[PDB]
Amino acid sequence: QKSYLENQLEAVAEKTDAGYTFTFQREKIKLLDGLEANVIKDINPFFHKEIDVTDDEVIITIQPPSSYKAFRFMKAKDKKSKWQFAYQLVQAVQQHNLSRLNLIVAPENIVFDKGLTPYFLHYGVKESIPPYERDEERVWQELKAAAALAVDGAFAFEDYLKFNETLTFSAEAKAILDAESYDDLLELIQTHIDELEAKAKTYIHIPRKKWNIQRYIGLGL
Amino acid sequence: QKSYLENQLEAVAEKTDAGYTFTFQREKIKLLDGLEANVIKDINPFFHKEIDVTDDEVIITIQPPSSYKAFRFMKAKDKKSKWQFAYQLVQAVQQHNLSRLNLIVAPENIVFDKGLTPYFLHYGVKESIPPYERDEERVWQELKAAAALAVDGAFAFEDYLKFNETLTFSAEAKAILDAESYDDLLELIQTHIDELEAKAKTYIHIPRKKWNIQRYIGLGL
Amino acid sequence: MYIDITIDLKHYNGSVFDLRLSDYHPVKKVIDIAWQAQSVSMPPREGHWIRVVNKDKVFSGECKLSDCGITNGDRLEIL
Amino acid sequence: LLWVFYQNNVQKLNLSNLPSSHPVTIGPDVKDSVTISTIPFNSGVISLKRYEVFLGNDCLGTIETDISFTLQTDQQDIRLILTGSEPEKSVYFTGNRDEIVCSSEKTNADIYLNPQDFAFAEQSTFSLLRAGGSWSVRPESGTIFLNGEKINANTPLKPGDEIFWNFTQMRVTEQDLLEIVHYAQFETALTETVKPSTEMQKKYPQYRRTPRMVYDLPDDRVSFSFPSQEFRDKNQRKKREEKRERVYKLYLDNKRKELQALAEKQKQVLEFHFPSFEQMKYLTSEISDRIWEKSLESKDYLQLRLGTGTVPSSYEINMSGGDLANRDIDDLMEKSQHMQRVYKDIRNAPVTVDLAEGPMGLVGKSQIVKNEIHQLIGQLSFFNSYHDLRFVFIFHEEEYKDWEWMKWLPQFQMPHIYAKGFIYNEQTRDQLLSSLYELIRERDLEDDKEKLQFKPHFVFVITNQQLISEHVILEYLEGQHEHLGISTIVAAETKESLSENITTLVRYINEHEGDILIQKKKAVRIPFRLDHHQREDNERFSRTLRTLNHEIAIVTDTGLIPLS
Amino acid sequence: TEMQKKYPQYRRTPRMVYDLPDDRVSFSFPSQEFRDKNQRKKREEKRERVYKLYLDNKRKELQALAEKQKQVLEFHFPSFEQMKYLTSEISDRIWEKSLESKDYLQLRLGTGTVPSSYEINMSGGDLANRDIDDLMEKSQHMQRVYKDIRNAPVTVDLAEGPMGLVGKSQIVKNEIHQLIGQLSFFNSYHDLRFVFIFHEEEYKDWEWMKWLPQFQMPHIYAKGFIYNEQTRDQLLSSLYELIRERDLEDDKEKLQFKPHFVFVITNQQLISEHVILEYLEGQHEHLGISTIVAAETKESLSENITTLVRYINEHEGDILIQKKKAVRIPFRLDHHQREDNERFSRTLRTLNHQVG
């Protein structure tokens, strides 16, 4: 098999105790000198990064602190946290400013703090290593699917991105996948978060032991 | 009655539907030509800004979007969100990169959005307007003090700043005030957030109305 | 008026020494005098440009030293 | 302006500074107005008059404004272009930007120069690129001239370089302010701004004193006090103590606020009066108005900062109140006692020593004292004009490459003979010290000794194994003629090496700690901690302090050598 | 007025004087904190009412001292408009002071807050181990209130040494009118004289001073204005010689010279290389001179300055240095009009002062 990133970048990637690694074939890139790659060091300075060059392949390694975690771990938490994470992701994508570094968004390429702010591991370069062109249409297409999968999912990241006609997707999927601009998506998320904020006050918190005691007392007749 | 800013900047600040405003008398600052203040427009793009320069004084107007709130409203939220916001503030201060703009920290000069990420309104321009020089020890002190109000909030802002050595604060504020470096403070916050994430699993949330029945129906018998 | 300046030849037979000269001389004459003093080989790079090290500034080979502001104590690194 | 273009180079010249009596010339000799070395000019010498073009005895016509004239000689080509207008000035701020594209072929460039708007616009393009806090250039088409020479490949850009492109000049400054000078019009989208300035920076080559600002320490007295008194039964007891609690809490809050204010004021004054060495560098960088603020008339000159530590307060606290021995220490007793200690002494404040009270000594391992003397010398130099203070310095020959940066300061220049203040060997010693001793003798032999204040105050610093142990001048350096405007500092590894007449002494224990142990000729002890320090910026500091105003020959430390 | 009977002539009469209040006020608290009504609750009224009466009796007092202080302060330093009025009718307050008096060369700059001259003393103390309450809190309230005065005149002296005015040129140039107006009234032309320096472009604004009596030079017939190189070269040399011949006598610190000169400078370029700058910059205050200087900012002033005043905007200002110490005292500006100056100056010009 191949991941969405795998076919787009033709690279080999793995995770190991030395951190994340990506590999490219020197014959399949426009890189000439190698010292051009130094620009990578000018983003996320608190990460640890290293690059080396050989006539046949090029290898890039990145190692973030120990507190961060991959994307798949998000599935366990509640729904409020998921909504807030989607909001953070959108607002982060909208703020990219530099010109020589290109974004690619996918579930294999994301990490997040304990504060729920996300980060991107790998970036392209304008001329040397892919993706070369700072396109926008594909970025938006990817972001919609990423948010849709973040909030919930019974499907792979491929399904939302490629098609909407395959199956009977939930109401939230249909609502999120149909937005015209960033402001509209932010508006769609704000009301959902506020509704959950309103709901909470109608509940009360009780430890399990006391509720079990009350159940025993009730059953004692 | 004067906020913590006025005693230092010698500038008035209020809220109006046009947006927060600041005013400096010309003789109180070293500025010579109004063009010098144009640099402020590049630091944060989507906050609408405006600058005016009369022969009497300088006026700065900042008008953040609709859904951004002032600092003081945070008091109503639960503990875990307070911890997450406290964690966010440290990272926000840490990553300041521009070498020509300086920071001033205080609850009067912060706004936070639905993601719980703060944003500063006023900035200093080197050798032109009051917050002249990047004094990092002052920022460290102010950040350490301000985290407590978010986490504990027992006393006024100046109380955690000036009269620390004498009073007997709670355990949490004392622990926060002991930190010696950024990494130590972040490590401190990590354990507290983990404790809450673990404890909450013991409870269950039940509609209070149904529990109101369940708790009283078993009477008389 | 007289001034005293320091001249660096690190590009051409690295050496250091200081001269006292009248202010109104042009820049190229300083280079000529330095060449006379050390008897260095090769002609200078065309244009007779120089750099003032302790100011981060550059001047062409046509200044009059009184004009573009080369007073006492400045270091002249010959390009 | 008159431009000249030849193979792979471009030069500039101004004509308005000369009358028509001087024929503008282009030739090989330095005497010529424009010099070229690679072209032999075998046919003749190019010249102009009025313009009229003449190659030696030959005539080639005339030149008109805003049009190019070409001519050939020695199988090579030369151009001439003449303009009389003057350019404009502007500044832009880059900020977060990572690339700047300049072109006249594409309208999407950040800075667009329409080719039609100027007579000699040419199709070209190039870009600036940033990486790791540094700027670099990268040509793409047309031509570019850097420092007057063409380039063809990616090149790093150094702080003072100047770029030339289509009669436009571009310069960069760290912090990323971009400056442009042009005879043209171009569209733009960058943010415009201007550099900060003051009066002193505008009068930079000249300097003159300004009125001084002085603060006074907080002198005050405070009063304090602490408690001294020791259904039916329930209501009787607790409420009185509750009233006690409330009242005493209010009283304590008032006193706490007052003491805090006083302590803060004292801290602020002490920090203001004695800044550290790094602050002196930074102030000198911007030409602040505090340079050379003190003078002989003032009292607080010749005062040095050694480090930071603990200092006693200058405001009295009358803790006496009521007699404590009456009864036991209660909780209120304990709170009052706890507050009594805290505000008695300030913490992390400058520790200061004076030099005007006689010879000073230093003790410790050699390396640390050697690394420390720099602070004292710099601090003394920052606060005094060279019209009043002059140095003399002795040291080991081997250490010369570490002590060199001080030779450029102004205070080291002797007042009566053109020679530097250093001393290496016997020759220089016999050259200088004899004259210095003779000059001092006249100061000693005069009745007005007590009345006058001799203008240049010599500060002797001695650190070398005594090559001076047998010279006559030691008669005065022994330290009994301090009214002669002379002072001393010494260094050694043990106390016994120094003399017995010292009136102040210091000692360094390790990398970060030290203490006084003699002052005012009496035994004392105070610990303190050293400051962080850097030693790679000294040359710029000294050279900057050299410039301020307040025949050919070589110059050396011991005289002048006429050239040839 | 009665003086109008003598309008062609004028002669001084005995001066009036006053003094500030300086008493000390004390405090005292000699007390602390079916048949119940008639026996002890009726005595509570007697116990309590006396202390409220005592507090009100005390309150009656501090205001009298405050009023006395205010009354004397606003009597010793009248504003400029009040002086126009007092001159429109020939009062006996014209030319009060004389060289012997110590308070001449004092100027009023505006109105502000001033500390009280009387002393408030808390002798009772005993704020701990005591059931402090209302009858003790009123003492704190009174201490807060009556410790200072509001809307009193702020004063500055000029006899100590050169002053300096800083701020935008328009406002600082406006205020010299008021300062010279104040100075011109208390002192006779037999004792004080002026010398003025300014730009030739503003000759119309300053014309009203042309007719004051003090501007006539004593030594040689001339008017003490300076336009340009011609007048400067015509006048300054004689003044230099006048200062020099005085400086050559050994009694420079034991006797006094009658005519006293006051310099006002706003344009340094016109004299930037002249010899007199030596006597002006140097410390020769004992020779019988003075100086006032105005400029854009601090950096354009020499080292002799002892007092510095800064004007911010159309209404307010503050002091910076007094007696070489660093201070910060705000004050607000007066209000006045410029049209009447001709009549005031001309009326003063006519009053021939008969000696003896």
Short mmCIF file of N, CA and C in Angstrom, two decimals, chain D residues 394-468:
data_model
loop_
_atom_site.label_atom_id
_atom_site.label_comp_id
_atom_site.label_asym_id
_atom_site.label_seq_id
_atom_site.Cartn_x
_atom_site.Cartn_y
_atom_site.Cartn_z
N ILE D 394 51.25 49.34 33.06
CA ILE D 394 52.42 48.47 33.02
C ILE D 394 51.95 47.03 33.03
N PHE D 395 52.63 46.16 32.29
CA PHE D 395 52.16 44.79 32.12
C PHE D 395 53.28 43.94 31.54
N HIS D 396 52.97 42.66 31.36
CA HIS D 396 53.94 41.72 30.83
C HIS D 396 53.97 41.79 29.30
N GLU D 397 55.15 41.56 28.73
CA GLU D 397 55.29 41.64 27.28
C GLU D 397 54.45 40.58 26.57
N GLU D 398 54.40 39.37 27.12
CA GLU D 398 53.70 38.29 26.43
C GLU D 398 52.22 38.60 26.27
N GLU D 399 51.62 39.32 27.21
CA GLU D 399 50.19 39.56 27.20
C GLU D 399 49.77 40.67 26.24
N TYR D 400 50.65 41.10 25.34
CA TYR D 400 50.35 42.29 24.56
C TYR D 400 49.10 42.12 23.72
N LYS D 401 48.92 40.96 23.10
CA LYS D 401 47.78 40.77 22.21
C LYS D 401 46.44 40.77 22.94
N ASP D 402 46.43 40.70 24.27
CA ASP D 402 45.19 40.84 25.02
C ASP D 402 44.93 42.28 25.44
N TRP D 403 46.00 43.05 25.66
CA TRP D 403 45.86 44.42 26.14
C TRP D 403 45.85 45.45 25.01
N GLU D 404 45.84 45.01 23.75
CA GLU D 404 46.06 45.94 22.65
C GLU D 404 44.89 46.90 22.47
N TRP D 405 43.67 46.44 22.72
CA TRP D 405 42.50 47.23 22.33
C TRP D 405 42.44 48.57 23.04
N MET D 406 43.17 48.75 24.13
CA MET D 406 43.11 50.01 24.86
C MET D 406 43.98 51.10 24.25
N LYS D 407 44.89 50.76 23.34
CA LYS D 407 45.80 51.78 22.81
C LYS D 407 45.06 52.88 22.06
N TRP D 408 43.84 52.63 21.61
CA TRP D 408 43.12 53.60 20.79
C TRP D 408 42.28 54.57 21.61
N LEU D 409 42.13 54.36 22.91
CA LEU D 409 41.34 55.28 23.71
C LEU D 409 42.00 56.66 23.73
N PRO D 410 41.23 57.72 23.96
CA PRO D 410 41.84 59.06 23.96
C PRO D 410 42.62 59.36 25.23
N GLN D 411 42.16 58.88 26.38
CA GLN D 411 42.83 59.19 27.64
C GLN D 411 44.25 58.66 27.71
N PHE D 412 44.62 57.68 26.89
CA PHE D 412 45.97 57.13 26.92
C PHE D 412 46.99 58.01 26.22
N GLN D 413 46.57 59.08 25.56
CA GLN D 413 47.50 59.92 24.81
C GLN D 413 48.20 60.90 25.75
N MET D 414 49.52 60.93 25.71
CA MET D 414 50.27 61.76 26.64
C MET D 414 50.05 63.24 26.33
N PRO D 415 50.20 64.11 27.32
CA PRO D 415 49.89 65.53 27.12
C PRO D 415 51.04 66.36 26.59
N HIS D 416 52.28 65.92 26.82
CA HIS D 416 53.44 66.76 26.53
C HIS D 416 54.44 66.16 25.55
N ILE D 417 54.42 64.86 25.30
CA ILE D 417 55.27 64.23 24.30
C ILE D 417 54.42 63.25 23.51
N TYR D 418 54.62 63.21 22.20
CA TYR D 418 53.81 62.38 21.32
C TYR D 418 54.26 60.93 21.47
N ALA D 419 53.69 60.24 22.45
CA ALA D 419 53.96 58.83 22.66
C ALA D 419 52.79 58.22 23.42
N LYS D 420 52.64 56.91 23.28
CA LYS D 420 51.55 56.20 23.94
C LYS D 420 51.88 55.96 25.41
N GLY D 421 50.91 55.41 26.13
CA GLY D 421 51.06 55.20 27.56
C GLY D 421 51.58 53.84 27.97
N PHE D 422 51.69 52.89 27.05
CA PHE D 422 52.12 51.56 27.41
C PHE D 422 53.59 51.54 27.80
N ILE D 423 54.01 50.44 28.41
CA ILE D 423 55.41 50.18 28.72
C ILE D 423 55.68 48.69 28.56
N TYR D 424 56.71 48.36 27.79
CA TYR D 424 57.11 46.98 27.56
C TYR D 424 58.42 46.63 28.23
N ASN D 425 59.50 47.33 27.88
CA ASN D 425 60.85 46.90 28.17
C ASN D 425 61.65 48.07 28.71
N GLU D 426 62.95 47.86 28.86
CA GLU D 426 63.79 48.88 29.47
C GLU D 426 63.85 50.15 28.62
N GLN D 427 63.90 50.00 27.30
CA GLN D 427 64.04 51.17 26.44
C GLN D 427 62.87 52.13 26.62
N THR D 428 61.64 51.62 26.50
CA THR D 428 60.47 52.48 26.64
C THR D 428 60.37 53.04 28.06
N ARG D 429 60.71 52.23 29.06
CA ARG D 429 60.67 52.69 30.44
C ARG D 429 61.58 53.89 30.62
N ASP D 430 62.84 53.77 30.21
CA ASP D 430 63.77 54.88 30.35
C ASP D 430 63.36 56.06 29.48
N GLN D 431 62.63 55.80 28.39
CA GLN D 431 62.19 56.89 27.53
C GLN D 431 61.10 57.72 28.21
N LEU D 432 60.14 57.06 28.86
CA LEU D 432 58.95 57.75 29.35
C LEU D 432 59.03 58.13 30.83
N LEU D 433 59.36 57.16 31.68
CA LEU D 433 59.21 57.38 33.12
C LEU D 433 60.11 58.51 33.60
N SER D 434 61.27 58.69 32.98
CA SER D 434 62.14 59.79 33.37
C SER D 434 61.44 61.13 33.17
N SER D 435 60.83 61.32 31.99
CA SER D 435 60.11 62.56 31.73
C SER D 435 58.93 62.72 32.67
N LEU D 436 58.20 61.63 32.94
CA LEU D 436 57.06 61.73 33.84
C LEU D 436 57.51 62.15 35.24
N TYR D 437 58.59 61.56 35.73
CA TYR D 437 59.11 61.91 37.05
C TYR D 437 59.55 63.37 37.08
N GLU D 438 60.22 63.83 36.02
CA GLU D 438 60.62 65.24 35.97
C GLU D 438 59.40 66.15 36.01
N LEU D 439 58.36 65.81 35.26
CA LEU D 439 57.16 66.65 35.25
C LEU D 439 56.51 66.68 36.63
N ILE D 440 56.44 65.52 37.30
CA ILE D 440 55.83 65.47 38.62
C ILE D 440 56.64 66.28 39.63
N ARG D 441 57.97 66.28 39.48
CA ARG D 441 58.81 67.02 40.41
C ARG D 441 58.37 68.47 40.52
N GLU D 442 58.11 69.13 39.39
CA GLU D 442 57.66 70.51 39.43
C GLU D 442 56.35 70.67 40.18
N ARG D 443 55.41 69.74 40.01
CA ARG D 443 54.21 69.77 40.83
C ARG D 443 54.56 69.71 42.31
N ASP D 444 55.50 68.85 42.68
CA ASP D 444 55.87 68.75 44.09
C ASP D 444 56.47 70.05 44.59
N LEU D 445 57.33 70.68 43.79
CA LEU D 445 58.04 71.88 44.21
C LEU D 445 57.24 73.14 43.87
N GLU D 446 56.20 73.42 44.64
CA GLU D 446 55.43 74.65 44.46
C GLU D 446 54.58 74.90 45.69
N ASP D 447 54.40 76.18 46.02
CA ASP D 447 53.68 76.55 47.24
C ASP D 447 52.17 76.37 47.08
N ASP D 448 51.65 76.59 45.87
CA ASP D 448 50.22 76.50 45.60
C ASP D 448 49.72 75.06 45.53
N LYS D 449 50.51 74.10 46.01
CA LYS D 449 50.11 72.69 45.97
C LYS D 449 48.72 72.48 46.56
N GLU D 450 48.49 72.99 47.77
CA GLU D 450 47.21 72.77 48.45
C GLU D 450 46.07 73.57 47.84
N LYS D 451 46.35 74.74 47.26
CA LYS D 451 45.29 75.60 46.75
C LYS D 451 44.76 75.13 45.41
N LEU D 452 45.64 74.88 44.45
CA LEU D 452 45.23 74.55 43.10
C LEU D 452 44.82 73.09 42.99
N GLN D 453 44.17 72.76 41.88
CA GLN D 453 43.94 71.39 41.46
C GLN D 453 44.58 71.20 40.09
N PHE D 454 45.68 70.45 40.06
CA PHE D 454 46.38 70.21 38.81
C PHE D 454 45.43 69.56 37.81
N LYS D 455 45.48 70.02 36.55
CA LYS D 455 44.41 69.67 35.61
C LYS D 455 44.43 68.18 35.27
N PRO D 456 45.43 67.65 34.57
CA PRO D 456 45.39 66.23 34.20
C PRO D 456 45.71 65.35 35.39
N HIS D 457 44.73 64.53 35.80
CA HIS D 457 44.90 63.63 36.93
C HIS D 457 45.37 62.26 36.45
N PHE D 458 46.61 61.91 36.78
CA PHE D 458 47.22 60.66 36.36
C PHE D 458 46.73 59.53 37.25
N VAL D 459 46.31 58.42 36.64
CA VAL D 459 45.93 57.22 37.36
C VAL D 459 46.89 56.11 36.96
N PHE D 460 47.78 55.74 37.88
CA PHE D 460 48.77 54.70 37.63
C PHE D 460 48.15 53.34 37.90
N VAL D 461 48.34 52.41 36.97
CA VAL D 461 47.96 51.01 37.15
C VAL D 461 49.22 50.19 37.00
N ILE D 462 49.50 49.34 37.99
CA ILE D 462 50.70 48.52 38.02
C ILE D 462 50.29 47.07 38.18
N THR D 463 50.76 46.21 37.28
CA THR D 463 50.44 44.80 37.34
C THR D 463 51.62 43.89 37.03
N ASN D 464 52.79 44.45 36.72
CA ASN D 464 53.91 43.65 36.26
C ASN D 464 54.86 43.32 37.40
N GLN D 465 55.55 42.19 37.26
CA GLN D 465 56.69 41.88 38.11
C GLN D 465 57.61 43.08 38.02
N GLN D 466 58.08 43.56 39.16
CA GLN D 466 58.65 44.90 39.21
C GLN D 466 59.92 44.95 38.37
N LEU D 467 59.80 45.50 37.16
CA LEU D 467 60.94 46.04 36.44
C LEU D 467 61.23 47.47 36.84
N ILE D 468 60.42 48.03 37.75
CA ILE D 468 60.56 49.40 38.21
C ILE D 468 61.07 49.47 39.64
#
